Amino acid sequence: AGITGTWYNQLGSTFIVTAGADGALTGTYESAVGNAESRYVLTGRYDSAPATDGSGTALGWTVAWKNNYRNAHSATTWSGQYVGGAEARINTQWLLTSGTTEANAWKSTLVGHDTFTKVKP
Amino acid sequence: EAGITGTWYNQLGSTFIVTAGADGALTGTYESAVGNAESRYVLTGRYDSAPATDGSGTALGWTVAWKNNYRNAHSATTWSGQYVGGAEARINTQWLLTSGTTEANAWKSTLVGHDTFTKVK
Amino acid sequence: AGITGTWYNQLGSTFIVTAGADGALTGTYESAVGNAESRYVLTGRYDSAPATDGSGTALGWTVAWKNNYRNAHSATTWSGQYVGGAEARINTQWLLTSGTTEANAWKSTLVGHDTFTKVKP
Amino acid sequence: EAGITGTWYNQLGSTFIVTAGADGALTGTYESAVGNAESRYVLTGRYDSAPATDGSGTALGWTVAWKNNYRNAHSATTWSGQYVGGAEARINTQWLLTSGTTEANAWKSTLVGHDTFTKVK
Protein backbone atom coordinates (compact mmCIF):
# COMPACT_ATOMS: atom_id res chain seq x y z
CA ALA A 1 0.00 0.00 0.00
CA GLY A 2 1.87 3.14 1.25
CA ILE A 3 1.74 6.40 3.24
CA THR A 4 -1.09 7.77 1.11
CA GLY A 5 -4.40 7.11 2.80
CA THR A 6 -6.62 7.75 5.80
CA TRP A 7 -5.00 7.23 9.19
CA TYR A 8 -6.38 7.10 12.72
CA ASN A 9 -5.07 7.23 16.25
CA GLN A 10 -6.82 5.73 19.37
CA LEU A 11 -7.83 9.14 20.84
CA GLY A 12 -10.25 10.53 18.22
CA SER A 13 -8.01 11.90 15.43
CA THR A 14 -8.14 11.19 11.73
CA PHE A 15 -5.82 12.41 9.03
CA ILE A 16 -5.98 12.07 5.30
CA VAL A 17 -2.69 12.36 3.48
CA THR A 18 -1.20 12.21 0.00
CA ALA A 19 2.47 11.27 -0.28
CA GLY A 20 3.99 12.81 -3.43
CA ALA A 21 6.61 10.94 -5.44
CA ASP A 22 9.43 13.34 -4.46
CA GLY A 23 8.78 13.56 -0.70
CA ALA A 24 5.83 15.85 -0.13
CA LEU A 25 3.14 15.11 2.47
CA THR A 26 -0.10 17.08 2.04
CA GLY A 27 -3.48 16.59 3.64
CA THR A 28 -6.03 17.25 6.35
CA TYR A 29 -6.00 16.53 10.09
CA GLU A 30 -9.38 16.32 11.83
CA SER A 31 -11.52 14.91 14.66
CA ALA A 32 -13.16 11.42 14.41
CA VAL A 33 -16.57 13.02 13.53
CA GLY A 34 -14.82 15.05 10.78
CA ASN A 35 -16.97 18.21 10.91
CA ALA A 36 -15.58 21.27 9.00
CA GLU A 37 -14.72 23.17 12.24
CA SER A 38 -12.32 20.40 13.39
CA ARG A 39 -10.45 20.07 9.98
CA TYR A 40 -6.96 21.63 9.63
CA VAL A 41 -4.34 21.71 6.87
CA LEU A 42 -1.38 19.28 7.27
CA THR A 43 1.93 19.58 5.37
CA GLY A 44 5.17 17.69 5.73
CA ARG A 45 7.92 15.64 4.16
CA TYR A 46 8.99 12.00 4.02
CA ASP A 47 12.00 10.04 2.76
CA SER A 48 10.96 9.07 -0.81
CA ALA A 49 13.79 6.51 -1.16
CA PRO A 50 14.02 4.65 2.18
CA ALA A 51 16.76 2.15 2.98
CA THR A 52 16.34 -1.37 1.54
CA ASP A 53 17.33 -3.13 4.83
CA GLY A 54 13.94 -3.41 6.61
CA SER A 55 14.10 0.06 8.15
CA GLY A 56 11.08 2.33 8.53
CA THR A 57 10.49 5.44 6.38
CA ALA A 58 11.29 8.69 8.16
CA LEU A 59 8.70 11.46 7.98
CA GLY A 60 7.28 14.50 9.67
CA TRP A 61 4.42 16.95 9.37
CA THR A 62 2.92 20.09 10.89
CA VAL A 63 -0.57 21.27 11.68
CA ALA A 64 -1.11 24.89 12.76
CA TRP A 65 -4.36 24.91 14.77
CA LYS A 66 -6.08 27.67 12.79
CA ASN A 67 -8.86 27.14 10.26
CA ASN A 68 -11.85 29.26 9.11
CA TYR A 69 -13.68 28.51 12.39
CA ARG A 70 -11.16 28.49 15.22
CA ASN A 71 -7.65 29.58 16.16
CA ALA A 72 -5.87 27.95 19.11
CA HIS A 73 -2.65 30.01 18.44
CA SER A 74 -0.61 26.81 18.43
CA ALA A 75 1.01 24.29 16.13
CA THR A 76 1.91 20.59 16.41
CA THR A 77 4.74 18.83 14.64
CA TRP A 78 4.88 15.00 14.42
CA SER A 79 8.25 13.32 13.73
CA GLY A 80 8.30 9.60 13.12
CA GLN A 81 8.50 6.66 10.83
CA TYR A 82 6.15 4.74 8.61
CA VAL A 83 6.39 0.92 8.76
CA GLY A 84 4.65 -0.91 5.92
CA GLY A 85 3.16 -4.37 5.73
CA ALA A 86 -0.22 -5.93 6.52
CA GLU A 87 -0.96 -3.51 9.40
CA ALA A 88 0.84 -0.34 8.18
CA ARG A 89 1.71 1.98 11.04
CA ILE A 90 3.11 5.49 11.54
CA ASN A 91 4.91 5.79 14.92
CA THR A 92 5.47 9.38 16.01
CA GLN A 93 6.64 11.71 18.70
CA TRP A 94 5.16 15.19 18.65
CA LEU A 95 5.64 18.73 19.93
CA LEU A 96 2.76 21.17 20.42
CA THR A 97 4.00 24.77 20.77
CA SER A 98 1.58 27.51 21.79
CA GLY A 99 2.19 31.19 21.01
CA THR A 100 3.00 32.71 24.42
CA THR A 101 4.32 35.79 26.10
CA GLU A 102 8.02 35.72 27.08
CA ALA A 103 6.93 35.03 30.75
CA ASN A 104 5.13 31.85 29.69
CA ALA A 105 7.63 30.67 27.04
CA TRP A 106 9.21 28.13 29.41
CA LYS A 107 5.88 26.21 29.41
CA SER A 108 5.01 26.80 25.72
CA THR A 109 5.65 23.23 24.50
CA LEU A 110 3.89 19.95 25.14
CA VAL A 111 5.51 16.64 24.09
CA GLY A 112 3.93 13.30 23.45
CA HIS A 113 3.75 10.28 21.21
CA ASP A 114 1.16 8.76 18.98
CA THR A 115 0.74 5.79 16.70
CA PHE A 116 -1.55 5.76 13.66
CA THR A 117 -2.96 2.90 11.61
CA LYS A 118 -5.37 2.75 8.65
CA VAL A 119 -7.94 0.88 10.88
CA LYS A 120 -11.03 2.99 11.58
CA PRO A 121 -11.92 2.66 15.33
CA GLU B 1 3.72 37.06 6.73
CA ALA B 2 6.62 39.65 6.31
CA GLY B 3 7.87 38.94 9.83
CA ILE B 4 8.60 35.28 9.18
CA THR B 5 9.53 35.54 5.51
CA GLY B 6 13.29 35.79 5.01
CA THR B 7 16.65 34.20 5.81
CA TRP B 8 17.41 32.84 9.28
CA TYR B 9 20.44 31.25 10.92
CA ASN B 10 20.69 29.04 13.94
CA GLN B 11 23.31 28.80 16.69
CA LEU B 12 25.12 25.99 14.79
CA GLY B 13 25.41 27.99 11.57
CA SER B 14 22.54 26.31 9.72
CA THR B 15 20.56 28.40 7.15
CA PHE B 16 16.75 28.50 6.83
CA ILE B 17 15.22 30.43 3.82
CA VAL B 18 11.41 30.67 4.22
CA THR B 19 8.36 32.28 2.67
CA ALA B 20 5.22 32.59 4.83
CA GLY B 21 2.08 32.48 2.65
CA ALA B 22 -1.20 34.29 3.42
CA ASP B 23 -2.92 30.90 3.89
CA GLY B 24 -0.53 29.77 6.70
CA ALA B 25 1.96 27.90 4.51
CA LEU B 26 5.70 27.86 5.14
CA THR B 27 7.88 26.84 2.16
CA GLY B 28 11.61 27.17 1.59
CA THR B 29 14.98 25.49 1.86
CA TYR B 30 17.19 24.42 4.74
CA GLU B 31 20.98 23.93 4.84
CA SER B 32 22.28 22.11 7.94
CA ALA B 33 25.69 22.84 9.43
CA VAL B 34 25.49 19.48 11.29
CA GLY B 35 24.62 15.88 10.68
CA ASN B 36 24.45 13.72 7.58
CA ALA B 37 23.55 16.61 5.32
CA GLU B 38 24.89 18.54 2.36
CA SER B 39 23.50 21.38 0.23
CA ARG B 40 19.87 22.56 0.48
CA TYR B 41 16.81 20.52 1.41
CA VAL B 42 13.12 21.29 0.87
CA LEU B 43 11.16 22.42 3.87
CA THR B 44 7.44 22.73 4.36
CA GLY B 45 5.41 23.78 7.36
CA ARG B 46 2.61 25.86 8.79
CA TYR B 47 2.26 28.93 10.92
CA ASP B 48 -0.57 30.75 12.64
CA SER B 49 -1.48 33.44 10.04
CA ALA B 50 -3.61 35.44 12.53
CA PRO B 51 -1.59 35.42 15.78
CA ALA B 52 -2.79 37.11 18.97
CA THR B 53 -1.93 40.88 19.04
CA ASP B 54 -0.98 40.77 22.76
CA GLY B 55 2.84 40.45 22.64
CA SER B 56 2.61 36.66 22.22
CA GLY B 57 4.73 34.80 19.76
CA THR B 58 3.40 33.25 16.52
CA ALA B 59 3.22 29.46 16.68
CA LEU B 60 4.74 27.52 13.79
CA GLY B 61 6.39 24.32 12.70
CA TRP B 62 8.20 22.81 9.74
CA THR B 63 9.74 19.59 8.50
CA VAL B 64 12.85 18.68 6.54
CA ALA B 65 13.27 15.10 5.21
CA TRP B 66 17.04 14.68 4.81
CA LYS B 67 16.94 13.59 1.18
CA ASN B 68 17.96 15.81 -1.71
CA ASN B 69 19.69 15.04 -5.02
CA TYR B 70 23.06 14.70 -3.29
CA ARG B 71 22.48 12.70 -0.13
CA ASN B 72 19.91 10.63 1.75
CA ALA B 73 20.26 10.29 5.56
CA HIS B 74 16.96 8.31 5.85
CA SER B 75 15.76 10.74 8.52
CA ALA B 76 13.51 13.79 9.03
CA THR B 77 13.57 16.69 11.49
CA THR B 78 10.58 18.66 12.66
CA TRP B 79 10.98 22.05 14.39
CA SER B 80 8.11 23.27 16.59
CA GLY B 81 8.31 26.79 17.98
CA GLN B 82 7.32 30.40 17.93
CA TYR B 83 8.32 33.48 16.05
CA VAL B 84 8.97 36.49 18.31
CA GLY B 85 8.87 39.70 16.24
CA GLY B 86 10.34 43.16 16.69
CA ALA B 87 13.81 44.64 16.02
CA GLU B 88 15.52 41.45 17.39
CA ALA B 89 13.42 38.81 15.49
CA ARG B 90 13.85 35.20 16.59
CA ILE B 91 12.27 31.81 16.03
CA ASN B 92 12.66 29.74 19.21
CA THR B 93 12.29 26.02 18.58
CA GLN B 94 12.46 22.50 19.87
CA TRP B 95 13.10 19.74 17.32
CA LEU B 96 12.69 16.03 16.82
CA LEU B 97 15.04 14.17 14.46
CA THR B 98 13.71 10.70 13.59
CA SER B 99 15.76 8.18 11.64
CA GLY B 100 14.25 5.20 9.85
CA THR B 101 15.17 2.12 11.91
CA THR B 102 14.44 -1.57 12.24
CA GLU B 103 11.79 -2.43 14.86
CA ALA B 104 14.52 -3.55 17.34
CA ASN B 105 16.22 -0.12 17.17
CA ALA B 106 13.01 1.98 17.12
CA TRP B 107 13.44 2.90 20.79
CA LYS B 108 16.56 4.91 19.78
CA SER B 109 15.14 6.42 16.56
CA THR B 110 14.60 9.99 17.77
CA LEU B 111 16.89 12.77 18.89
CA VAL B 112 15.59 15.93 20.55
CA GLY B 113 17.10 19.37 20.80
CA HIS B 114 16.52 23.10 20.65
CA ASP B 115 17.54 25.71 18.09
CA THR B 116 17.33 29.50 18.18
CA PHE B 117 17.06 31.14 14.76
CA THR B 118 18.04 34.78 14.24
CA LYS B 119 16.70 36.74 11.26
CA VAL B 120 19.20 38.24 8.81
CA LYS B 121 18.46 42.00 8.17
CA ALA C 1 -1.45 -2.04 45.50
CA GLY C 2 0.92 0.89 44.66
CA ILE C 3 4.14 2.06 42.96
CA THR C 4 6.27 -0.31 45.03
CA GLY C 5 6.91 -3.48 43.08
CA THR C 6 8.47 -5.07 40.02
CA TRP C 7 7.63 -3.42 36.70
CA TYR C 8 8.21 -4.45 33.09
CA ASN C 9 8.10 -2.86 29.68
CA GLN C 10 7.50 -4.72 26.33
CA LEU C 11 11.13 -4.37 25.12
CA GLY C 12 13.11 -6.40 27.70
CA SER C 13 13.44 -4.08 30.73
CA THR C 14 12.59 -4.78 34.33
CA PHE C 15 12.76 -2.44 37.27
CA ILE C 16 12.26 -3.04 40.95
CA VAL C 17 11.27 -0.02 42.99
CA THR C 18 10.39 1.00 46.52
CA ALA C 19 8.22 4.09 46.95
CA GLY C 20 8.93 5.75 50.31
CA ALA C 21 6.15 7.39 52.31
CA ASP C 22 7.47 10.93 51.72
CA GLY C 23 8.14 10.74 47.97
CA ALA C 24 11.35 8.81 47.42
CA LEU C 25 11.75 6.28 44.60
CA THR C 26 14.70 3.88 45.00
CA GLY C 27 15.51 0.70 43.15
CA THR C 28 17.19 -1.22 40.36
CA TYR C 29 16.74 -1.10 36.58
CA GLU C 30 17.83 -4.18 34.62
CA SER C 31 17.42 -6.40 31.54
CA ALA C 32 14.72 -9.16 31.38
CA VAL C 33 17.34 -11.88 32.19
CA GLY C 34 18.46 -9.80 35.21
CA ASN C 35 22.18 -10.71 35.24
CA ALA C 36 24.43 -8.54 37.49
CA GLU C 37 26.12 -6.80 34.50
CA SER C 38 22.76 -5.40 33.25
CA ARG C 39 21.59 -4.06 36.73
CA TYR C 40 21.81 -0.30 37.44
CA VAL C 41 20.80 1.93 40.35
CA LEU C 42 17.53 3.90 39.93
CA THR C 43 16.54 6.93 42.05
CA GLY C 44 13.67 9.35 41.72
CA ARG C 45 10.69 11.09 43.27
CA TYR C 46 6.91 10.83 43.15
CA ASP C 47 3.95 12.86 44.42
CA SER C 48 3.18 11.23 47.81
CA ALA C 49 -0.22 12.98 48.11
CA PRO C 50 -1.83 12.85 44.63
CA ALA C 51 -5.08 14.64 43.79
CA THR C 52 -8.32 12.91 44.87
CA ASP C 53 -10.10 13.54 41.51
CA GLY C 54 -9.07 10.43 39.50
CA SER C 55 -5.78 11.90 38.29
CA GLY C 56 -2.59 9.89 37.92
CA THR C 57 0.40 10.21 40.31
CA ALA C 58 3.27 12.22 38.88
CA LEU C 59 6.75 10.73 39.15
CA GLY C 60 10.19 10.59 37.66
CA TRP C 61 13.46 8.73 37.99
CA THR C 62 17.02 8.53 36.67
CA VAL C 63 19.39 5.74 35.77
CA ALA C 64 23.03 6.57 34.99
CA TRP C 65 24.30 3.72 32.78
CA LYS C 66 27.35 2.87 34.90
CA ASN C 67 27.67 -0.14 37.19
CA ASN C 68 30.62 -2.31 38.34
CA TYR C 69 30.76 -3.99 34.89
CA ARG C 70 30.04 -1.38 32.24
CA ASN C 71 29.90 2.36 31.62
CA ALA C 72 27.95 3.73 28.65
CA HIS C 73 28.71 7.39 29.70
CA SER C 74 25.00 8.21 29.56
CA ALA C 75 21.94 8.65 31.72
CA THR C 76 18.18 8.26 31.16
CA THR C 77 15.44 10.14 32.94
CA TRP C 78 11.79 8.94 32.82
CA SER C 79 9.01 11.47 33.58
CA GLY C 80 5.47 10.18 33.85
CA GLN C 81 2.51 9.16 35.87
CA TYR C 82 1.39 6.11 37.76
CA VAL C 83 -2.26 5.04 37.28
CA GLY C 84 -3.54 2.53 39.83
CA GLY C 85 -6.27 -0.07 39.61
CA ALA C 86 -6.51 -3.69 38.47
CA GLU C 87 -3.81 -3.30 35.78
CA ALA C 88 -1.54 -0.64 37.39
CA ARG C 89 0.51 1.23 34.82
CA ILE C 90 3.33 3.78 34.72
CA ASN C 91 3.20 5.87 31.50
CA THR C 92 6.43 7.72 30.78
CA GLN C 93 8.38 9.85 28.39
CA TRP C 94 12.14 9.65 28.65
CA LEU C 95 15.37 11.43 27.73
CA LEU C 96 18.68 9.60 27.29
CA THR C 97 21.64 12.03 27.34
CA SER C 98 25.10 10.80 26.42
CA GLY C 99 28.29 12.55 27.56
CA THR C 100 29.65 14.14 24.36
CA THR C 101 32.17 16.57 23.05
CA GLU C 102 30.88 20.09 22.31
CA ALA C 103 30.84 19.18 18.53
CA ASN C 104 28.43 16.31 19.18
CA ALA C 105 26.29 18.00 21.86
CA TRP C 106 23.51 18.83 19.38
CA LYS C 107 22.87 15.05 19.00
CA SER C 108 23.50 14.11 22.67
CA THR C 109 19.86 13.39 23.60
CA LEU C 110 17.44 10.67 22.55
CA VAL C 111 13.72 10.97 23.40
CA GLY C 112 11.10 8.29 23.64
CA HIS C 113 8.19 6.89 25.58
CA ASP C 114 7.54 3.74 27.49
CA THR C 115 4.76 2.13 29.47
CA PHE C 116 5.34 -0.29 32.34
CA THR C 117 3.02 -2.77 34.04
CA LYS C 118 3.53 -5.35 36.81
CA VAL C 119 2.82 -8.19 34.27
CA LYS C 120 5.91 -10.30 33.57
CA PRO C 121 6.15 -10.91 29.75
CA GLU D 1 32.36 14.70 42.39
CA ALA D 2 33.74 18.26 43.21
CA GLY D 3 32.87 19.50 39.73
CA ILE D 4 29.15 18.88 40.09
CA THR D 5 28.83 19.51 43.83
CA GLY D 6 27.73 23.06 44.58
CA THR D 7 25.12 25.73 43.85
CA TRP D 8 23.80 26.30 40.33
CA TYR D 9 21.37 28.74 38.74
CA ASN D 10 19.40 28.49 35.56
CA GLN D 11 18.44 31.10 32.97
CA LEU D 12 15.06 31.67 34.71
CA GLY D 13 16.63 32.34 38.12
CA SER D 14 15.94 28.91 39.62
CA THR D 15 18.42 27.53 42.24
CA PHE D 16 19.82 23.98 42.33
CA ILE D 17 21.97 22.93 45.39
CA VAL D 18 23.54 19.49 44.79
CA THR D 19 26.01 17.05 46.27
CA ALA D 20 27.53 14.41 43.96
CA GLY D 21 28.39 11.24 45.92
CA ALA D 22 31.27 8.85 45.11
CA ASP D 23 28.72 6.13 44.23
CA GLY D 24 27.01 8.23 41.49
CA ALA D 25 24.25 9.73 43.65
CA LEU D 26 22.96 13.26 43.25
CA THR D 27 21.06 14.69 46.26
CA GLY D 28 20.03 18.24 47.10
CA THR D 29 17.31 20.84 46.88
CA TYR D 30 15.72 22.81 44.06
CA GLU D 31 13.94 26.20 44.16
CA SER D 32 11.99 27.07 40.99
CA ALA D 33 11.58 30.64 39.80
CA VAL D 34 8.63 29.47 37.63
CA GLY D 35 5.52 27.38 37.86
CA ASN D 36 3.36 26.20 40.74
CA ALA D 37 6.24 26.14 43.18
CA GLU D 38 7.39 27.79 46.39
CA SER D 39 10.40 27.27 48.67
CA ARG D 40 12.78 24.30 48.30
CA TYR D 41 12.00 20.82 47.00
CA VAL D 42 13.96 17.58 47.38
CA LEU D 43 15.89 16.41 44.37
CA THR D 44 17.51 13.07 43.68
CA GLY D 45 19.38 11.80 40.66
CA ARG D 46 22.39 10.02 39.26
CA TYR D 47 25.52 10.94 37.39
CA ASP D 48 28.31 9.06 35.67
CA SER D 49 30.98 8.90 38.44
CA ALA D 50 33.75 7.82 36.01
CA PRO D 51 33.23 9.99 32.90
CA ALA D 52 35.43 9.73 29.81
CA THR D 53 38.67 11.83 30.13
CA ASP D 54 38.46 13.01 26.49
CA GLY D 55 36.83 16.47 26.82
CA SER D 56 33.34 14.92 26.88
CA GLY D 57 30.70 16.05 29.29
CA THR D 58 29.51 13.99 32.29
CA ALA D 59 26.05 12.53 31.78
CA LEU D 60 23.52 13.03 34.57
CA GLY D 61 19.88 13.39 35.46
CA TRP D 62 17.65 14.29 38.38
CA THR D 63 14.03 14.52 39.43
CA VAL D 64 11.97 16.95 41.49
CA ALA D 65 8.39 15.99 42.51
CA TRP D 66 6.66 19.35 43.11
CA LYS D 67 5.45 18.56 46.61
CA ASN D 68 6.99 20.01 49.75
CA ASN D 69 5.46 21.07 53.08
CA TYR D 70 4.09 24.26 51.54
CA ARG D 71 2.61 23.31 48.18
CA ASN D 72 1.68 20.37 45.96
CA ALA D 73 1.49 20.93 42.18
CA HIS D 74 0.80 17.18 41.50
CA SER D 75 3.66 17.14 38.99
CA ALA D 76 7.32 16.12 38.62
CA THR D 77 10.17 17.38 36.43
CA THR D 78 13.12 15.36 35.26
CA TRP D 79 16.27 17.05 33.88
CA SER D 80 18.55 14.99 31.61
CA GLY D 81 21.86 16.50 30.56
CA GLN D 82 25.57 16.80 30.87
CA TYR D 83 27.99 18.62 33.08
CA VAL D 84 30.72 20.46 31.15
CA GLY D 85 33.62 21.28 33.49
CA GLY D 86 36.38 23.88 33.45
CA ALA D 87 36.52 27.57 34.46
CA GLU D 88 33.03 28.20 32.92
CA ALA D 89 31.17 25.17 34.44
CA ARG D 90 27.71 24.43 33.05
CA ILE D 91 25.05 21.74 33.20
CA ASN D 92 23.18 21.68 29.87
CA THR D 93 19.79 20.02 30.15
CA GLN D 94 16.52 19.08 28.55
CA TRP D 95 13.55 18.51 30.88
CA LEU D 96 10.19 16.82 31.03
CA LEU D 97 7.49 18.17 33.35
CA THR D 98 4.65 15.66 33.82
CA SER D 99 1.45 16.54 35.65
CA GLY D 100 -0.91 13.95 37.07
CA THR D 101 -3.99 13.95 34.81
CA THR D 102 -7.16 12.03 34.11
CA GLU D 103 -6.88 9.50 31.25
CA ALA D 104 -8.73 11.89 28.86
CA ASN D 105 -6.12 14.63 29.44
CA ALA D 106 -3.04 12.35 29.48
CA TRP D 107 -2.10 13.39 25.95
CA LYS D 108 -1.37 16.91 27.32
CA SER D 109 0.34 15.80 30.57
CA THR D 110 3.93 16.63 29.66
CA LEU D 111 5.81 19.82 28.93
CA VAL D 112 9.32 19.84 27.48
CA GLY D 113 12.04 22.45 27.64
CA HIS D 114 15.71 23.16 28.09
CA ASP D 115 17.64 24.78 30.93
CA THR D 116 21.27 25.88 31.17
CA PHE D 117 22.68 25.88 34.70
CA THR D 118 25.72 28.00 35.61
CA LYS D 119 27.82 27.14 38.67
CA VAL D 120 28.20 29.77 41.39
CA LYS D 121 31.94 30.31 42.32
Ligand SMILES: NC(=O)c1coc(CN(Cc2ccc3c(c2)OCO3)C(=O)c2coc(CN(Cc3ccc4c(c3)OCO4)C(=O)c3coc(CCl)n3)n2)n1
Ligand atom coordinates in the same frame (compact mmCIF):
# COMPACT_ATOMS: atom_id res chain seq x y z
N1 LIG E 1 -10.99 20.59 17.82
C1 LIG E 1 -10.30 21.65 17.21
O1 LIG E 1 -10.92 22.32 16.43
C2 LIG E 1 -8.89 21.92 17.56
C3 LIG E 1 -8.14 23.05 17.43
O2 LIG E 1 -6.85 22.82 17.90
C4 LIG E 1 -6.88 21.53 18.36
C5 LIG E 1 -5.76 20.86 18.96
N2 LIG E 1 -6.08 19.60 19.50
C6 LIG E 1 -5.99 18.45 18.56
C7 LIG E 1 -4.74 17.65 18.53
C8 LIG E 1 -4.66 16.36 17.95
C9 LIG E 1 -3.48 15.62 17.96
C10 LIG E 1 -2.40 16.18 18.51
C11 LIG E 1 -2.44 17.48 19.07
C12 LIG E 1 -3.57 18.18 19.11
O3 LIG E 1 -1.16 17.77 19.56
C13 LIG E 1 -0.56 16.52 19.63
O4 LIG E 1 -1.11 15.69 18.68
C14 LIG E 1 -6.73 19.58 20.80
O5 LIG E 1 -6.84 20.64 21.41
C15 LIG E 1 -7.22 18.36 21.41
C16 LIG E 1 -8.13 18.26 22.40
O6 LIG E 1 -8.30 16.96 22.73
C17 LIG E 1 -7.45 16.23 21.92
C18 LIG E 1 -7.41 14.80 21.98
N3 LIG E 1 -7.55 14.05 20.77
C19 LIG E 1 -8.90 13.95 20.18
C20 LIG E 1 -9.25 15.14 19.25
C21 LIG E 1 -10.22 16.12 19.57
C22 LIG E 1 -10.50 17.21 18.70
C23 LIG E 1 -9.79 17.33 17.51
C24 LIG E 1 -8.78 16.39 17.19
C25 LIG E 1 -8.52 15.33 18.04
O7 LIG E 1 -8.24 16.78 15.94
C26 LIG E 1 -8.69 18.10 15.69
O8 LIG E 1 -9.86 18.26 16.50
C27 LIG E 1 -6.41 13.46 20.11
O9 LIG E 1 -6.62 12.79 19.11
C28 LIG E 1 -5.01 13.59 20.51
C29 LIG E 1 -4.36 14.70 21.05
O10 LIG E 1 -3.02 14.42 21.10
C30 LIG E 1 -2.89 13.17 20.56
C31 LIG E 1 -1.66 12.50 20.44
CL1 LIG E 1 -1.13 11.78 21.95
N4 LIG E 1 -4.06 12.67 20.17
N5 LIG E 1 -6.75 17.05 21.11
N6 LIG E 1 -8.09 20.96 18.15
Ligand SMILES: NC(=O)c1coc(CN(Cc2ccc3c(c2)OCO3)C(=O)c2coc(CN(Cc3ccc4c(c3)OCO4)C(=O)c3coc(CCl)n3)n2)n1
Ligand atom coordinates in the same frame (compact mmCIF):
# COMPACT_ATOMS: atom_id res chain seq x y z
N1 LIG F 1 22.76 -3.69 28.95
C1 LIG F 1 23.47 -2.74 29.70
O1 LIG F 1 24.26 -3.16 30.50
C2 LIG F 1 23.25 -1.29 29.47
C3 LIG F 1 24.04 -0.21 29.74
O2 LIG F 1 23.41 0.95 29.33
C4 LIG F 1 22.24 0.53 28.76
C5 LIG F 1 21.27 1.40 28.17
N2 LIG F 1 20.23 0.71 27.50
C6 LIG F 1 19.06 0.33 28.34
C7 LIG F 1 17.88 1.22 28.37
C8 LIG F 1 16.61 0.80 28.84
C9 LIG F 1 15.51 1.66 28.84
C10 LIG F 1 15.68 2.91 28.41
C11 LIG F 1 16.95 3.36 27.97
C12 LIG F 1 18.00 2.55 27.92
O3 LIG F 1 16.80 4.70 27.58
C13 LIG F 1 15.44 4.85 27.44
O4 LIG F 1 14.79 3.96 28.28
C14 LIG F 1 20.52 0.22 26.17
O5 LIG F 1 21.58 0.54 25.65
C15 LIG F 1 19.58 -0.59 25.42
C16 LIG F 1 19.87 -1.39 24.37
O6 LIG F 1 18.73 -1.97 23.92
C17 LIG F 1 17.70 -1.49 24.71
C18 LIG F 1 16.36 -1.94 24.52
N3 LIG F 1 15.62 -2.44 25.65
C19 LIG F 1 15.97 -3.79 26.14
C20 LIG F 1 17.14 -3.79 27.15
C21 LIG F 1 18.41 -4.34 26.86
C22 LIG F 1 19.48 -4.30 27.80
C23 LIG F 1 19.27 -3.71 29.04
C24 LIG F 1 18.02 -3.11 29.34
C25 LIG F 1 16.99 -3.15 28.41
O7 LIG F 1 18.11 -2.59 30.65
C26 LIG F 1 19.50 -2.58 30.99
O8 LIG F 1 20.10 -3.54 30.12
C27 LIG F 1 14.64 -1.64 26.32
O9 LIG F 1 14.02 -2.14 27.24
C28 LIG F 1 14.30 -0.24 26.03
C29 LIG F 1 15.14 0.79 25.63
O10 LIG F 1 14.42 1.96 25.64
C30 LIG F 1 13.17 1.60 26.07
C31 LIG F 1 12.11 2.52 26.20
CL1 LIG F 1 11.34 2.90 24.67
N4 LIG F 1 13.09 0.30 26.34
N5 LIG F 1 18.17 -0.63 25.63
N6 LIG F 1 22.11 -0.82 28.83
Ligand SMILES: CCCCCCCCC(=O)CCCO
Ligand atom coordinates in the same frame (compact mmCIF):
# COMPACT_ATOMS: atom_id res chain seq x y z
C1 LIG G 1 23.37 11.86 12.54
C2 LIG G 1 23.18 12.47 11.15
C3 LIG G 1 21.71 12.64 10.72
C4 LIG G 1 21.27 14.11 10.63
C5 LIG G 1 20.87 14.78 9.29
C6 LIG G 1 20.79 16.32 9.44
C7 LIG G 1 19.96 16.67 10.67
C8 LIG G 1 20.23 18.05 11.13
C9 LIG G 1 19.34 18.32 12.33
O1 LIG G 1 18.31 17.79 12.60
C10 LIG G 1 19.86 19.45 13.07
C11 LIG G 1 19.13 19.76 14.34
C12 LIG G 1 19.97 20.86 14.96
O2 LIG G 1 19.89 22.01 14.13
Ligand SMILES: CCCCCCCCC(=O)CCCO
Ligand atom coordinates in the same frame (compact mmCIF):
# COMPACT_ATOMS: atom_id res chain seq x y z
C1 LIG H 1 2.31 25.00 35.57
C2 LIG H 1 2.86 24.90 36.99
C3 LIG H 1 3.50 23.54 37.35
C4 LIG H 1 5.03 23.63 37.54
C5 LIG H 1 5.71 23.37 38.90
C6 LIG H 1 7.18 23.83 38.89
C7 LIG H 1 7.88 23.29 37.65
C8 LIG H 1 9.11 24.05 37.33
C9 LIG H 1 9.75 23.42 36.11
O1 LIG H 1 9.62 22.30 35.73
C10 LIG H 1 10.66 24.36 35.51
C11 LIG H 1 11.29 23.90 34.23
C12 LIG H 1 12.07 25.12 33.77
O2 LIG H 1 13.12 25.36 34.68
